[PDB]
């Protein structure tokens, strides 16, 4: 019922590990489908090959900008920006998958995986999933970011798709 997608992470080509997520389509369907669809590439565009352009250790890893690759791009499968479905789920800890935005109702394709409890984001960013496996692949990634987000090596979603 709840779809599971995976990301095969690579650090400058060198494959790191696999991180799979459970998307909560049961409570946040439109947002979960957008991520799922974008993870399979069934629409002609998606996450395969994009980089995690902003990694702030002890905060989160952010990626999903497949258009401009610098945090200023992205598009949803519904167009360039869809609304915030709801804020039923909260940033309760590490592994939480949430939508990055530019303020209310500007969801596109950018997301971020929390590597810490980030309550200050509750109500501002739509939580739609969680890390099922490979949480410490996400942790190991923190190793290539910086307090200001800049990353040393290029972290890419080498491959991604749907498992279930």
């Amino acid at each position: 019922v709840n779809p599971t997608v995976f990301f095969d992470i690579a650090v400058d080509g060198e494959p790191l590990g696999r991180v799979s997520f459970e998307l909560f389509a049961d409570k946040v369907p439109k947002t979960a489908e957008n991520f799922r669809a974008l993870s399979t590439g069934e629409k002609g565009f998606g996450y395969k090959g994009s980089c995690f352009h902003r990694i702030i250790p002890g905060f989160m890893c952010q990626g999903g900008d497949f258009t401009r690759h610098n945090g200023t791009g992205g598009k949803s499968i519904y167009g360039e920006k869809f609304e915030d479905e709801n804020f039923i789920l909260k940033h309760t800890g590490p592994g939480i998958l949430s939508m990055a935005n530019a303020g209310p109702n500007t969801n596109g394709s950018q997301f971020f995986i929390c590597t810490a409890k980030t309550e200050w984001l509750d109500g501002k960013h739509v939580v739609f999933g969680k890390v099922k496996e490979g949480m410490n692949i996400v942790e190991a990634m923190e190793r290539f970011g910086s307090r200001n987000g800049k990353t040393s090596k290029k972290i890419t979603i080498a491959d991604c798709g749907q498992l279930e």
Binding site: F59, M60, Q62, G71, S98, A100, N101, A102, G103, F112, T118, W120, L121, K124, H125
Partner: peptide
Amino acid sequence: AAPF
């Protein structure tokens, strides 16, 4: 820039 968001999440801050």
